Ligand binder design. Sequence first.
Ligand SMILES: Nc1nc2c(ncn2[C@@H]2O[C@H](COP(=O)(O)OP(=O)(O)OP(=O)(O)O)[C@@H](O)[C@H]2O)c(=O)[nH]1
Ligand SMILES: Nc1nc2c(ncn2[C@@H]2O[C@H](COP(=O)(O)OP(=O)(O)OP(=O)(O)O)[C@@H](O)[C@H]2O)c(=O)[nH]1
Ligand SMILES: [Mg+2]
Ligand SMILES: [Mg+2]
Lengths: 167, 167
Amino acid sequence: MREYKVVVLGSGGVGKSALTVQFVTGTFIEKYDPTIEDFYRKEIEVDSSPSVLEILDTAGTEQFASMRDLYIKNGQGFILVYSLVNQQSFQDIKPMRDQIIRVKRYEKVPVILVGNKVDLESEREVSSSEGRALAEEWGCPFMETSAKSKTMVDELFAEIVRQMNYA
Amino acid sequence: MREYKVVVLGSGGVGKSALTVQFVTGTFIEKYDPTIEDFYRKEIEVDSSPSVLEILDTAGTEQFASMRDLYIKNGQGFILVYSLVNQQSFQDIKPMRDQIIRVKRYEKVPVILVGNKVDLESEREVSSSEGRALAEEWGCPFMETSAKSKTMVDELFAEIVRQMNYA
Ligand SMILES: Nc1nc2c(ncn2[C@@H]2O[C@H](COP(=O)(O)OP(=O)(O)OP(=O)(O)O)[C@@H](O)[C@H]2O)c(=O)[nH]1
Ligand SMILES: Nc1nc2c(ncn2[C@@H]2O[C@H](COP(=O)(O)OP(=O)(O)OP(=O)(O)O)[C@@H](O)[C@H]2O)c(=O)[nH]1
Ligand SMILES: [Mg+2]
Ligand SMILES: [Mg+2]
């Protein structure tokens, strides 16, 4: 019920592009192509409401550090992704919300914390309760996902819309 | 039908309530009763699609920036009114759209600029060129109206619906 600008942030290879491409195409990318800066748009029915999601999928590998503030300035909603099989990506996510609040200057920014790659949880490095405790401290929702399933990815994107709708 | 939440903004005595009640009930109100806050609901056919409007008619006297931020938060479309026979009400409207964007956080907010009381044009203090220039700077439609005109009032609410169908 408006245009929704979501920025997906997180370190290299956590599955930011696989999550966005699952949402947009219903396909799973199996190869790893490091992202420069990709924009997607899709219509979605969130609780029957028409919502045009515009998704900025950013670079994680070496990111584009200085520019991240520009991405944050322009974003309305933020999906903070880590890989649950990579402890370091989780650690890398911990300053991200503070950086968002710094750029935006207000505390109630719509964010979701995502632990991705749940289908690889035989090699889990970060437990649900850890992710969930970070999200609780931030006051935002926590989800765990696999970019392999359309269903999990659709609820992710549906939820960020609800968070942006209620701010 | 879809819901359209519309907020009517501007300075004291420009005719916000009179426009709203002409729209809703088809009565022109002559008495000046300063508004605190009132909600109206009304179903209109815009380009033959039924649209239901929930209109928030606001106070114009004794500003209160915080109340205005709440009014804005709940609205998806905005009608900014000045009285063409009151120059100060036109200058008063000029910060208003910027406050709207600030509160909303999204850039392309549906707005129409209205110079009301065109029936009292013998006392016009704000020319059509001026009002039209502010609207061309804002990139929004401009209208001059009279609350005594069912035709102009219905075209005003019809047009805010069209703008909200855009963004
Ligand atoms: N098994 C599995 N692999 C995943 C999943 N999500 C991502 N991958 C794989 O992990 C690799 C990286 O995924 P990308 O989406 O390219 O990672 P990214 O976060 O976009 O990386 P950058 O663009 O470099 O920041 C690819 O080989 C993906 O197939 C998932 O949930 N399950
Ligand atoms: N002649 C004429 N009078 C108008 C018109 N619109 C409003 N008025 C009159 O101007 C006075 C104020 O109108 P309201 O609609 O109450 O003004 P308002 O903007 O709601 O004022 P607040 O609620 O105090 O902010 C009343 O006497 C109205 O009848 C119009 O188009 N023509
Ligand atoms: Mg990528
Ligand atoms: Mg009033």
